[PDB]
Amino acid sequence: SMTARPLSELVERGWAAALEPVADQVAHMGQFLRAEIAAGRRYLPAGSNVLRAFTFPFDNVRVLIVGQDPYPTPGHAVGLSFSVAPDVRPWPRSLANIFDEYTADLGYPLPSNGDLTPWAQRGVLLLNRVLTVRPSNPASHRGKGWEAVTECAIRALAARAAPLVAILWGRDASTLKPMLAAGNCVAIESPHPSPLSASRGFFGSRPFSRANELLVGMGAEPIDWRLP
């Protein structure tokens, strides 16, 4: 549908204005995914979930979390970075690692399920640097045109007259650091929660509590991170 329908239809009003400079690029990504299907290759998440992160209000974002690309296993990715549908179990190992750090950092019990929508509904943008992947092949759509879209999104948030905290998980997420240089923006960076990288600095990084300290310091309301 992103080949065929305008941003005014695909995403929330604030996001449609914020992504105007990449309107043509988004249509192009629509044609890229159409070509993958034509060729008999698959993508995740489902087409109608690809831009889901931009369907919550642009004006309400206080924190963004940025990962690499969507979950590679069919049935996991839903268009919100690291989120899974409420009926998914077991949790993907990166999300089990996030929830371990979440309990260590904040003292809360393990969430009931893998659904991060409460965060999306409380001013957290759940972004992946790249918004599609081929099943079972991490980073398979790196450098196919999404990066200009996620760069435009971060630049737009940063230009708002509002505080912003960015939590940047892993190397592809960290390439947005330069666009956050302005005085109303602060970036937290750590290795990715994936089992391959988590032991190099994700565990003990306290991203949730540090994000709230940074917000309070800038005169913003902290995120209520508590999942049911």
From Swiss-Prot:
<dbReference type="GO" id="GO:0004844">
    <property type="term" value="F:uracil DNA N-glycosylase activity"/>
</dbReference>
<protein>
    <recommendedName>
        <fullName>Uracil-DNA glycosylase</fullName>
        <ecNumber>3.2.2.27</ecNumber>
    </recommendedName>
</protein>
<feature type="active site" description="Proton acceptor">
    <location>
        <position position="69"/>
    </location>
</feature>
<keyword id="KW-0963">Cytoplasm</keyword>
<dbReference type="Pfam" id="PF03167">
    <property type="entry name" value="UDG"/>
</dbReference>
<keyword id="KW-0234">DNA repair</keyword>
<comment type="function">
    <text>Excises uracil residues from the DNA which can arise as a result of misincorporation of dUMP residues by DNA polymerase or due to deamination of cytosine.</text>
</comment>
<dbReference type="GO" id="GO:0097510">
    <property type="term" value="P:base-excision repair, AP site formation via deaminated base removal"/>
</dbReference>
<dbReference type="InterPro" id="IPR018085">
    <property type="entry name" value="Ura-DNA_Glyclase_AS"/>
</dbReference>
<dbReference type="InterPro" id="IPR002043">
    <property type="entry name" value="UDG_fam1"/>
</dbReference>
<keyword id="KW-0378">Hydrolase</keyword>
<dbReference type="GO" id="GO:0006284">
    <property type="term" value="P:base-excision repair"/>
</dbReference>
<dbReference type="InterPro" id="IPR005122">
    <property type="entry name" value="Uracil-DNA_glycosylase-like"/>
</dbReference>
<keyword id="KW-0227">DNA damage</keyword>
<comment type="similarity">
    <text>Belongs to the uracil-DNA glycosylase (UDG) superfamily. UNG family.</text>
</comment>
<dbReference type="InterPro" id="IPR036895">
    <property type="entry name" value="Uracil-DNA_glycosylase-like_sf"/>
</dbReference>
<dbReference type="GO" id="GO:0005737">
    <property type="term" value="C:cytoplasm"/>
</dbReference>
